[PDB]
Coordinates of all heavy atoms in Angstrom, one line a residue:
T452 N -3.2 -15.9 12.4 CA -2.0 -16.1 13.2 C -0.9 -15.2 12.9 O -0.1 -14.8 13.8 CB -1.4 -17.5 13.1 OG1 -0.7 -17.7 11.8 CG2 -2.6 -18.5 13.1
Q453 N -0.8 -14.7 11.7 CA 0.1 -13.7 11.2 C -0.6 -12.7 10.3 O -1.6 -13.1 9.6 CB 1.4 -14.3 10.5 CG 2.3 -14.9 11.5 CD 1.9 -16.3 11.9 OE1 1.6 -16.6 13.1 NE2 1.7 -17.2 10.9
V454 N -0.1 -11.5 10.2 CA -0.6 -10.5 9.3 C 0.5 -9.5 8.8 O 1.4 -9.2 9.6 CB -1.8 -9.7 10.0 CG1 -1.3 -9.0 11.3 CG2 -2.4 -8.7 9.0
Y455 N 0.4 -9.1 7.6 CA 1.3 -8.1 7.1 C 0.5 -7.2 6.1 O -0.4 -7.7 5.4 CB 2.5 -8.7 6.4 CG 3.3 -9.7 7.3 CD1 2.9 -11.0 7.3 CD2 4.3 -9.3 8.1 CE1 3.5 -11.9 8.2 CE2 5.0 -10.1 8.9 CZ 4.6 -11.5 8.9 OH 5.3 -12.4 9.7
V456 N 0.9 -6.0 6.0 CA 0.3 -5.0 5.0 C 1.4 -4.4 4.2 O 2.5 -4.0 4.8 CB -0.6 -4.0 5.7 CG1 -1.8 -4.7 6.4 CG2 0.2 -3.2 6.7
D457 N 1.2 -4.2 2.9 CA 2.2 -3.5 2.1 C 1.5 -2.4 1.3 O 0.4 -2.5 0.9 CB 2.8 -4.6 1.0 CG 3.2 -5.8 1.7 OD1 3.9 -5.7 2.8 OD2 2.9 -6.9 1.2
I458 N 2.3 -1.3 1.2 CA 1.7 0.0 0.6 C 2.6 0.4 -0.6 O 3.8 0.3 -0.5 CB 1.7 1.1 1.7 CG1 1.0 0.6 2.9 CG2 1.0 2.3 1.1 CD1 1.9 0.1 4.0
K459 N 2.0 0.8 -1.7 CA 2.6 1.3 -2.8 C 1.7 2.2 -3.6 O 0.4 2.2 -3.4 CB 3.1 0.2 -3.7 CG 2.0 -0.5 -4.5 CD 2.6 -1.5 -5.5 CE 1.6 -2.1 -6.4 NZ 2.1 -2.6 -7.7
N460 N 2.3 3.2 -4.3 CA 1.5 4.1 -5.1 C 1.0 3.4 -6.4 O 1.6 2.5 -6.9 CB 2.3 5.3 -5.5 CG 2.9 6.0 -4.3 OD1 2.4 6.9 -3.6 ND2 4.2 5.6 -4.0
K461 N -0.1 3.9 -6.9 CA -0.8 3.3 -8.0 C 0.2 3.3 -9.2 O 0.9 4.3 -9.5 CB -2.1 4.0 -8.4 CG -2.8 3.5 -9.7 CD -3.1 2.0 -9.5 CE -4.3 1.8 -8.5 NZ -5.5 2.4 -9.0
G462 N 0.3 2.2 -10.1 CA 1.0 2.1 -11.2 C 2.4 1.6 -11.0 O 3.1 1.2 -11.9
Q463 N 2.9 1.7 -9.7 CA 4.2 1.2 -9.4 C 4.3 -0.3 -9.6 O 3.4 -1.0 -9.6 CB 4.6 1.5 -7.9 CG 4.7 3.0 -7.7 CD 5.3 3.3 -6.3 OE1 4.6 3.6 -5.4 NE2 6.6 3.3 -6.3
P464 N 5.6 -0.8 -9.9 CA 5.8 -2.2 -10.0 C 5.5 -2.9 -8.7 O 5.7 -2.4 -7.6 CB 7.3 -2.3 -10.5 CG 7.9 -1.1 -10.0 CD 6.8 0.0 -10.0
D465 N 5.2 -4.2 -8.8 CA 4.9 -5.0 -7.7 C 6.0 -5.0 -6.7 O 5.9 -5.2 -5.5 CB 4.4 -6.4 -8.1 CG 5.5 -7.2 -8.8 OD1 6.0 -6.6 -9.8 OD2 5.8 -8.3 -8.4
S466 N 7.2 -5.0 -7.3 CA 8.4 -5.0 -6.4 C 8.5 -3.8 -5.4 O 9.3 -3.8 -4.5 CB 9.7 -5.1 -7.2 OG 9.8 -4.0 -8.1
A467 N 7.7 -2.8 -5.7 CA 7.8 -1.6 -4.9 C 7.0 -1.7 -3.6 O 7.1 -0.7 -2.8 CB 7.2 -0.4 -5.7
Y468 N 6.3 -2.8 -3.3 CA 5.6 -2.9 -2.1 C 6.6 -2.8 -0.9 O 7.6 -3.4 -0.8 CB 4.9 -4.2 -2.0 CG 3.5 -4.2 -2.5 CD1 3.1 -5.0 -3.6 CD2 2.5 -3.4 -1.9 CE1 1.7 -4.9 -4.1 CE2 1.2 -3.3 -2.4 CZ 0.9 -4.1 -3.4 OH -0.5 -4.0 -3.8
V469 N 6.2 -2.0 0.1 CA 7.0 -1.7 1.3 C 6.0 -1.8 2.5 O 4.8 -1.6 2.4 CB 7.7 -0.4 1.3 CG1 8.7 -0.4 0.1 CG2 6.8 0.8 1.2
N470 N 6.6 -2.2 3.7 CA 5.9 -2.3 4.9 C 6.2 -1.1 5.9 O 5.6 -1.1 7.0 CB 6.2 -3.6 5.6 CG 7.5 -3.7 6.2 OD1 8.6 -3.4 5.6 ND2 7.6 -4.1 7.5
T471 N 7.2 -0.3 5.6 CA 7.6 0.8 6.5 C 6.5 1.8 6.5 O 5.7 1.9 5.6 CB 8.9 1.4 6.1 OG1 9.2 2.5 6.9 CG2 8.8 1.9 4.7
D472 N 6.4 2.6 7.6 CA 5.5 3.7 7.7 C 5.7 4.8 6.5 O 6.8 5.0 6.1 CB 5.6 4.4 9.0 CG 5.2 3.6 10.1 OD1 5.0 2.4 9.9 OD2 5.2 4.0 11.3
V473 N 4.7 5.4 6.1 CA 4.7 6.3 4.9 C 4.1 7.6 5.3 O 3.1 7.6 6.1 CB 4.0 5.7 3.7 CG1 4.1 6.7 2.6 CG2 4.5 4.4 3.3
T474 N 4.7 8.7 4.9 CA 4.2 10.0 5.1 C 3.9 10.7 3.8 O 4.0 10.2 2.7 CB 5.1 10.9 5.9 OG1 4.6 12.2 6.2 CG2 6.5 11.0 5.2
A475 N 3.5 12.0 3.8 CA 3.2 12.8 2.6 C 3.8 14.2 2.8 O 4.0 14.7 3.9 CB 1.7 12.8 2.4
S476 N 4.1 14.8 1.6 CA 4.6 16.1 1.6 C 3.6 17.1 2.1 O 2.4 16.8 2.5 CB 5.0 16.5 0.2 OG 3.9 16.8 -0.6
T477 N 4.0 18.4 2.1 CA 3.1 19.4 2.6 C 1.8 19.5 1.8 O 0.7 19.7 2.3 CB 3.8 20.8 2.6 OG1 5.1 20.6 3.2 CG2 3.0 21.8 3.4
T478 N 2.0 19.4 0.5 CA 0.8 19.6 -0.5 C 0.3 18.2 -1.0 O 0.0 18.2 -2.2 CB 1.2 20.5 -1.6 OG1 2.3 19.9 -2.4 CG2 1.7 21.8 -1.1
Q479 N 0.3 17.2 -0.2 CA -0.2 15.9 -0.6 C -1.2 15.4 0.4 O -1.2 15.6 1.6 CB 1.0 14.9 -0.7 CG 1.8 15.0 -1.9 CD 3.1 14.3 -1.8 OE1 3.3 13.4 -0.9 NE2 4.1 14.6 -2.6
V480 N -2.2 14.7 -0.1 CA -3.3 14.1 0.7 C -3.4 12.6 0.4 O -3.5 12.3 -0.9 CB -4.6 14.8 0.4 CG1 -5.8 14.2 1.3 CG2 -4.5 16.3 0.8
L481 N -3.4 11.8 1.4 CA -3.5 10.4 1.2 C -4.9 10.0 0.8 O -5.9 10.5 1.3 CB -3.1 9.6 2.5 CG -1.7 10.0 3.1 CD1 -1.4 9.2 4.2 CD2 -0.6 9.8 2.0
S482 N -5.0 9.0 -0.1 CA -6.3 8.6 -0.6 C -6.3 7.1 -1.0 O -5.2 6.6 -1.5 CB -6.8 9.4 -1.7 OG -6.2 9.1 -2.9
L483 N -7.3 6.4 -0.7 CA -7.5 5.0 -1.1 C -8.8 4.7 -1.7 O -9.8 5.3 -1.4 CB -7.2 4.0 0.1 CG -7.2 2.6 -0.1 CD1 -6.2 1.9 0.7 CD2 -8.6 2.0 0.2
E484 N -8.9 3.7 -2.5 CA -10.1 3.3 -3.2 C -10.3 1.8 -3.4 O -9.4 1.1 -2.8 CB -10.2 4.0 -4.6 CG -9.9 5.5 -4.5 CD -8.4 5.8 -4.7 OE1 -7.6 4.9 -4.2 OE2 -8.0 6.9 -5.1
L485 N -11.2 1.4 -4.3 CA -11.2 -0.1 -4.6 C -10.3 -0.4 -5.7 O -9.5 0.4 -6.1 CB -12.7 -0.4 -4.9 CG -13.6 -0.6 -3.7 CD1 -13.8 0.7 -2.9 CD2 -14.9 -1.3 -4.1
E486 N -10.5 -1.6 -6.3 CA -9.5 -2.2 -7.3 C -8.2 -2.2 -6.5 O -7.1 -2.1 -7.2 CB -9.5 -1.3 -8.5 CG -10.7 -1.3 -9.4 CD -11.8 -0.4 -8.9 OE1 -11.6 0.4 -8.0 OE2 -12.9 -0.3 -9.5
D487 N -8.2 -2.3 -5.2 CA -7.0 -2.3 -4.4 C -7.3 -3.3 -3.3 O -8.3 -3.9 -3.2 CB -6.8 -0.8 -3.9 CG -5.4 -0.7 -3.2 OD1 -4.5 -1.3 -3.8 OD2 -5.4 -0.1 -2.1
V488 N -6.2 -3.4 -2.4 CA -6.3 -4.3 -1.3 C -6.3 -5.7 -1.7 O -7.3 -6.4 -1.7 CB -7.6 -4.0 -0.4 CG1 -7.6 -4.7 0.9 CG2 -7.9 -2.5 -0.2
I489 N -5.1 -6.2 -2.2 CA -4.9 -7.5 -2.7 C -4.8 -8.4 -1.6 O -3.8 -8.5 -0.8 CB -3.6 -7.5 -3.6 CG1 -3.8 -6.5 -4.7 CG2 -3.5 -9.0 -4.2 CD1 -5.0 -6.7 -5.6
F490 N -5.8 -9.3 -1.4 CA -5.7 -10.4 -0.3 C -5.0 -11.6 -0.8 O -4.9 -11.8 -2.0 CB -7.2 -10.7 0.0 CG -7.9 -9.6 0.7 CD1 -8.6 -8.7 0.0 CD2 -8.0 -9.5 2.1 CE1 -9.3 -7.7 0.6 CE2 -8.7 -8.5 2.7 CZ -9.4 -7.6 1.9
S491 N -4.3 -12.2 0.1 CA -3.6 -13.4 -0.2 C -3.3 -14.2 1.0 O -3.3 -13.7 2.1 CB -2.2 -13.1 -0.9 OG -1.5 -12.1 -0.1
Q492 N -3.1 -15.6 0.8 CA -2.8 -16.5 1.9 C -1.3 -16.9 1.7 O -0.9 -17.3 0.7 CB -3.6 -17.7 1.8 CG -5.1 -17.4 2.1 CD -5.8 -18.6 2.7 OE1 -6.5 -18.5 3.8 NE2 -5.7 -19.8 2.1

């Protein structure tokens, strides 16, 4: 019925989670892996 996603860089404090769109600098490449994607109800 509802859904939200939060994005933060590795190692950052949990308070750093944000829902706004994110971009990257000229010399940066976005990457994602496991040990990530914290599910919750």
Side-chain angles (χ1 to χ4, degrees):
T452 77
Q453 286 78 240
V454 60
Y455 309 86
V456 298
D457 311 318
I458 308 97
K459 70 173 189 157
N460 311 268
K461 178 60 68 67
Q463 292 191 265
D465 61 307
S466 60
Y468 266 122
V469 297
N470 75 308
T471 180
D472 294 4
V473 182
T474 183
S476 75
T477 313
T478 62
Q479 281 165 17
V480 178
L481 306 183
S482 73
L483 182 143
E484 313 86 331
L485 277 72
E486 293 83 3
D487 190 44
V488 192
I489 302 301
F490 294 86
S491 54
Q492 296 208 127

